[PDB]
From Swiss-Prot, chain B:
Entry protein name: Lon protease homolog, mitochondrial
Phenotypic consequence of G135P: Enhances the basal, but not the stimulated ATPase activity, and abolishes peptidase activity
Tissues showing expression: Duodenum, heart, lung and liver, but not thymus.
Pathology noted in the entry: CODAS syndrome: A rare syndrome characterized by the combination of cerebral, ocular, dental, auricular, and skeletal features. These include developmental delay, craniofacial anomalies, cataracts, ptosis, median nasal groove, delayed tooth eruption, hearing loss, short stature, delayed epiphyseal ossification, metaphyseal hip dysplasia, and vertebral coronal clefts.
Outcome when changing W11P: Has normal basal, but low stimulated ATPase activity, and abolishes peptidase activity
Active site: S96, K139
Consequence when changing T121V: Enhances the basal, but not the stimulated ATPase activity
Domain spans labelled Lon proteolytic: 1-189
Family: Belongs to the peptidase S16 family.
Domain notes: The Lon N-terminal domains are crucial for the overall structure of the protein, maintaining it in a conformation allowing its proper functioning. The AP-domain (ATP-binding and proteolytic domains) has a closed-ring conformation in the presence of AMP-PNP and its N-terminal entry gate appears closed. Upon ADP binding, it switches to a lock-washer conformation and its N-terminal gate opens.
Length: 100, 189
């Protein structure tokens, strides 16, 4: 769909350049595209090449299409304040999860 | 701008605004000099749920960055802290203030006041990859009149800042970044 609207916009702002424009023959080429569409709305493909400690790419079946969500986890306090102690490390989950 | 406070843009439901964000200690810091008990946050400002979420994750990133950067300091791991985020942001815009929190806390943990009149925004993740936020136009036009001169914005939104009418952009310098560790080297030169 969005590709449809943008191709339509390219042709339309092309048509405006005929009724009065100098050109009688539009020919879009990648260098010229800016004039009809402006600067790119995206540049990144994935949010990044993996950070070494703690993430893994995760596919998920969102309501519209697939998507590539990233799971991210990290430490919350220095690990070894008491090596001999015994108080197991709780998670704290986030992300507005439902109970299941 | 004394220690522990930072101004921050926000898309109010009617035009922009420049509400501050503030921070404070809440109990003596050495009631247990060797105690292993968390420096719990205590947020206020009549928050919604998504604000609670963003505040918690921002707290975690702050607590992580500091142990990664300045190991001897431990003010933030164990020190109860009230934090105040004024209400007024439109709920869809509510995550947008996140980045400000992450610097607020750090200021209090090092004692350096921020550099003067340097507003900032943008969402944060657990590893510090800033994300785009909407409604930049109201934000810029509102921050223009507060005397701010050096805005900083997520790098993934920059195109929208280079499409507004030129007269609005004249004057203030702009920065752009993607990984938060850069901003910590701007705000505290």
């Amino acid at each position: 769909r969005n590709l449809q609207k943008q191709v339509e916009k390219v042709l339309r702002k092309s048509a405006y350049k005929i009724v009065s424009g100098e050109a009688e023959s539009v020919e879009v080429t990648p260098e010229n595209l800016q004039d009809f569409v402006g600067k790119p709305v995206f540049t990144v493909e994935r949010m990044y090449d993996v950070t070494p400690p703690g993430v893994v790419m995760g596919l998920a079946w969102t309501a519209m299409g697939g998507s590539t969500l990233f799971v991210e986890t990290s430490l919350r306090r220095p690990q070894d304040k008491d090596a001999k102690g015994d108080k197991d490390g709780s998670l704290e989950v986030t992300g507005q999860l439902g109970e299941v | 701008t004394p220690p522990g406070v930072v101004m921050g843009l926000a898309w109010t439901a009617m035009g922009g605004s420049t509400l501050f964000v503030e921070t404070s200690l809440r109990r003596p810091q050495d009631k247990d000099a060797k105690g292993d008990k968390d420096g719990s946050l205590e947020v206020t400002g009549q928050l919604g749920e998504v604000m609670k979420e963003s505040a918690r994750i921002a707290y975690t990133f702050a607590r992580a960055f500091l142990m990664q950067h300045a190991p001897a300091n431990d003010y933030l791991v164990t020190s109860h802290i009230h934090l105040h985020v004024p209400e007024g942001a439109t709920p869809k815009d509510g995550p947008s203030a996140g980045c400000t929190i992450v610097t607020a806390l750090l200021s209090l943990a090092m004692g350096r006041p921020v550099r003067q009149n340097l507003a900032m925004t943008g969402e944060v993740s657990l590893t510090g990859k800033i994300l785009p936020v909407g409604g930049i136009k109201e934000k810029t036009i509102a921050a223009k009149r507060a005397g701010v001169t050096c805005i900083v914005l997520p790098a993934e939104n920059k195109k929208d800042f280079y499409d507004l009418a030129a007269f609005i952009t004249e004057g203030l310098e702009v920065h752009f970044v993607e990984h938060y560790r850069e901003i910590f080297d701007i705000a505290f030169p």
